[PDB]
Design a protein around this ligand. Structure first.
Ligand SMILES: Nc1ccn([C@H]2CC[C@@H](COP(=O)(O)OP(=O)(O)OP(=O)(O)O)O2)c(=O)n1
Ligand SMILES: [Mg+2]
Ligand code: NA
Length: 359
DNA sequence: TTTTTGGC
DNA sequence: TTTTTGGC
DNA sequence: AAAAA
């Protein structure tokens, strides 16, 4: 009867009846994330997450009874929204100069919290002043971010995601004809838009040297076709908390990870002119065939669903879950699974469909 | 930097 | 008061 | 921020 504090024990579809509340909570979490106050950031993210799962809109304070992740601070924000249809706390964040600058600077691909603070303390407030400054030096990633800014700020839609899927499939099958390409992330959860397109590549017949060289061969193929705009391996990046999977280094050694920017020609997109092409972010994961169920679960998301699955495993089941395996800490054995359903069953959880993982 | 919960 | 909040 | 201990 009671709503669980874990997102892995709730069904969260794209039907949100509480957008007025969750938009204000996302603004407050984002402000704390950009300022690195991680404890309170997560508390606002959890509060936003549970409200997204509600099958009715909050219309009175009596509706917050028996709902987890709602303390005195979150209750006062909800109360304030019930009163005038707006949050005075979220409105102050939207008018904050540090929030506005950080939000704008980190909207450029390759700009992390350290670079955005650096620019803010120099007195910069706009992207035109940053781009035209005579002394500033930029990384190759930041250069791609500025050169393809308008295409990246506009999001990828489902027709564009499927056209990129065709490019990935053609390239992969040239080197591994038996390879299976699965679209993961937000698009797997039924989202109609995304900041990127995510893929999981697996091959039953591939060898260790073949698995380790596939992403190298795929990106070289795109480079020869004139489709590669930017490329980097995750091993040489160092990402901020928002993009950190929090996995063991021996777990990550098992996979091959690559992130690109692809030139997507309009003639490849089947949907409802300009330069005739659009720059698209693509994230690629190569995983060993035997670890495919754990990798599909881990890269489907959402971020909130993943971290609560692991928190539940640790604190409720005395288990250890990651993107390659499930370990029972008490019995000292690994639990085998060939499907996402088998993983949920080992955890003692009712199976949650990917379209219900939008926590 | 806050409050809540649950055994001592 | 100190610890956890997705890994060891 | 909000638990947990
Ligand atoms: N800190 C993070 C970030 C990501 N992920 C996982 C789950 C989703 C997957 C792909 O990540 P994103 O592309 O960033 O997110 P998304 O769900 O696809 O959403 P969008 O691409 O639309 O921002 O990686 C995670 O476990 N923890
Ligand atoms: Mg994505
Ligand atoms: Na960024």
């Amino acid at each position: 009867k009671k709503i669980s504090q874990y997102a892995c024990q709730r069904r969260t579809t794209l039907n949100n009846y509480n957008q007025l509340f969750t938009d204000a909570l996302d603004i407050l979490a984002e402000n704390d994330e950009l300022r690195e106050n991680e404890g309170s950031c997560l508390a606002f993210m959890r509060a936003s997450s549970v409200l997204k799962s509600l099958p009715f809109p909050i219309t009175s304070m009596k509706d917050t009874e028996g709902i987890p992740c709602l303390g005195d601070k979150v209750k006062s924000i909800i109360e304030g929204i019930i009163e005038d249809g707006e949050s005075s706390e979220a409105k102050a964040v939207l008018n904050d100069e540090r929030y506005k600058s950080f939000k704008l600077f980190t909207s450029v691909f390759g700009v992390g919290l350290k670079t955005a603070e650096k620019w803010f303390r120099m007195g910069f407030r706009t992207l035109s002043k940053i781009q035209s400054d005579k002394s500033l030096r930029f990384t190759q990633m930041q250069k791609a971010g500025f050169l393809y800014y308008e295409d990246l700020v506009s999001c990828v839609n489902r027709p564009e995601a499927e056209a990129v899927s065709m490019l990935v499939k053609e390239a992969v099958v040239t080197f591994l004809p038996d390879a299976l390409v699965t679209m993961t992330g937000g698009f797997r959860r039924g989202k109609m838009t995304g900041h990127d397109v995510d893929f999981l590549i697996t091959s039953p017949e591939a060898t260790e040297d073949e698995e380790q060289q596939l992403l190298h061969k795929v990106t070289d193929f795109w480079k020869q076709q004139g489709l590669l705009l930017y490329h980097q391996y995750h091993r040489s990046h160092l990402a901020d908390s928002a993009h950190n999977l929090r996995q063991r280094s021996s777990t990550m050694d098992v996979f091959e990870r690559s992130f690109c920017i692809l030139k997507l020609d309009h003639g490849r997109v089947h949907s409802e002119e300009g330069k005739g092409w659009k720059a698209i972010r693509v994230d690629l994961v190569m995983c060993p065939y035997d670890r495919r169920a754990f990798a599909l679960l881990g890269w489907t998301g959402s971020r909130q669903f993943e971290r609560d699955l692991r928190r539940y495993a640790t604190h409720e089941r005395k288990m250890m879950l990651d993107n390659h395996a499930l370990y029972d800490r008490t019995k000292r054995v690994f639990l085998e699974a060939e499907s996402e359903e088998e993983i949920f069953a080992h955890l003692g959880l009712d199976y949650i469909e990917p379209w219900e993982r939008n926590a």
